[PDB]
Amino acid sequence: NILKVIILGDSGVGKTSLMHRYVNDKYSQQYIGADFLTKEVTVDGDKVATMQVWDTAAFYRGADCCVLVYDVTNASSFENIKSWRDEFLVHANVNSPETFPFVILGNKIDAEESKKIVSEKSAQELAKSLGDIPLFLTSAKNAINVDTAFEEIARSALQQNQ
Ligand SMILES: Nc1nc2c(ncn2[C@@H]2O[C@H](COP(=O)(O)OP(=O)(O)O)[C@@H](O)[C@H]2O)c(=O)[nH]1
Ligand SMILES: [Mg+2]
Secondary structure: OEEEEEEEOOOOOOHHHHHHHHHHOOOOOOOOOOOOEEEEEEEOEEEEEEEEEEOOOOOOOOOOEEEEEEEOOOHHHHHOHHHHHHHHHHHHOOOOOOOOOEEEEEEOOOOOHHHOOOOHHHHHHHHHHOOOOOEEEEEOOOOEOHHHHHHHHHHHHHHHHO
């Protein structure tokens, strides 16, 4: 019952912060020897699993979902999302590249409007173009939508693991 989730994206977008929000429900501006952190996945009563979250911080062996993160205030980080999808696929040796699941997170949605660079339309259009990859806008800092996004990351990983 072990789900292996990898998080990729440019330095600075909030990958580490997203993991800490999901695993420990905390954020510090001030935020190791562990290749991954674990969190129990809880469902509608239902069924349970352990998620391993691997931060960029054998690595690819057994991945069940890959999360691609950009920062809505950093245009280059968004322009590199397809490159990260492709980097994963050209190195991870997944069983079925056609169906392996990705999820895209556009982080720092708490930022003031004046600092946001990437539109929601632009990101929806890219996520569609790459194969209808699910897209979530998030804030690790303010606890906006990280729960919703990881519910889909966990669902995706459960499907792929089984
Ligand atoms: N405003 C805002 N800043 C964030 C958010 N998530 C991370 N950051 C900041 O962005 C910087 C990079 O975060 P980090 O998690 O280290 O990014 P990584 O390099 O992708 O692991 C740190 O200064 C964070 O505190 C967020 O949701 N909102
Ligand atoms: Mg980091």
